[PDB]
Amino acid sequence: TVLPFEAMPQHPGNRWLRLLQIWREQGYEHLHLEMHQTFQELGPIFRYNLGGPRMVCVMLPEDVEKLQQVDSLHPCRMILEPWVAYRQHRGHKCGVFLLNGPEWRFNRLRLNPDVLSPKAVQRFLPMVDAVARDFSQALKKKVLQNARGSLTLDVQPSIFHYTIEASNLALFGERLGLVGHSPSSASLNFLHALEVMFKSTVQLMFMPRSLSRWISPKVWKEHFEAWDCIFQYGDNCIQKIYQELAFNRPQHYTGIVAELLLKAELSLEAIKANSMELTAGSVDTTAFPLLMTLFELARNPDVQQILRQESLAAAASISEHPQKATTELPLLRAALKETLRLYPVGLFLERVVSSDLVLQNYHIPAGTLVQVFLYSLGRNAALFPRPERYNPQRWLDINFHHVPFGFGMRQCLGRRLAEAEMLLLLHHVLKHFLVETLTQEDIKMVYSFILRPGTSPLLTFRAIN
């Protein structure tokens, strides 16, 4: 028994007043909380009144399963008009994140062997380990200068400079010297450019180019100015590596981008495009869940202890061969799966379905936008018993339950790189320090394309020596 599409519960809010409030509020900060509240009132499935196109919202893994079967050769995501507009204007190609169809497949297949593949992970993992080591060592130096052998600080700036340092070394094979040193003007500008880029995305996301072009021209100006800065930073990296490789082909591994340039399977302008997305992509996406794991470990000392015991046992083997960290730290990997469950990076998994399907016994026609709301999915007390409870052990009992990086062929390209940056930092921090905090109040998240914390709590790093 299958019900028609219009039989599905509808969102009570209308598209026009929705447009008007973003113009008034300069963004959609609360979106995650608003959508979560809607699911509690209308059920695990509802249709959004987009006024013509079909838009469906889901929050169940059983829906994610069915959504993967309809993926096809070319899984299609909604076109992100503000980002694409910048590429067209400046004459740049689109990377694997913004592409669709056969153009996406060509790029993706030529990127997987050097960005995501296990053989590639074995090569960039020891590089990331060196950065992660330097972070803990630099921290230990400042901790031992205090009488109590502890340092209480806002970790957010330092963690952000780690994700910049670790990503640049993994991608380009260049140490920027940000870990253990004062932040560079160039890095601070890049971070702010990203901050502004995401802010302006939300404002321009919901309305057509036609409307936004005269209603919000200064939002458009602000968005492009932010991208001009992001692109300036990324192009500087690409110009350095291209000149270095033009004069000498190295025998040893010197980063992800180096491998892509040497293989030359993709055009320079496509390597430039994809490398830009990997450079800008890896900063905020890796740092925010790293910061949230640190907070949740500071909150749950009992959980921390188990993870510390695991990391101190596997310390000797990871010191000799860093690539072991993946296989020898199941609890820490499960702690990361837990952090991403409670605190997702984005909010929606998008799919513009290629053929008809049945979701929650409702008919879903072809060309329907299906959005998987990750914030709500992580909170279902039937699938994730005690959902408010930060318990990594839950992942070792168990399927489409864990899906923060997505699914199928379109599933996150940086997934393995992000995992390595997170694992290795936490491993070295747990080895030498005890994280603590008096802030036991949950941090309020802010929707600015990337679901980011509104507060950065004070964390005490106490040395074990």
Ligand code: HEM
């Ligand atoms: C650790 C947190 C991260 C999460 C949760 C995450 C999650 C996601 C999700 C859900 C997708 C799309 C999956 C889909 O639609 O099927 C995705 C795509 C992508 N991510 Fe991330 N990501 C993370 C880190 C990274 C990092 C560090 C980078 C930069 C290297 C990155 C680069 C990308 C790219 C290029 C894509 C596009 C994949 C494609 O269209 O083929 N991500 N990410």
Ligand SMILES: CCC(=O)N[C@@H]1CCCc2c(-c3ccc(Cl)c(F)c3)cncc21
């Ligand atoms: C629902 C999960 C999700 O999409 N998270 C976030 C959304 C914000 C951007 C993003 C990226 C990404 C960020 C910036 C650029 Cl330039 C890019 F090219 C890709 C990669 N990976 C995850 C995510």
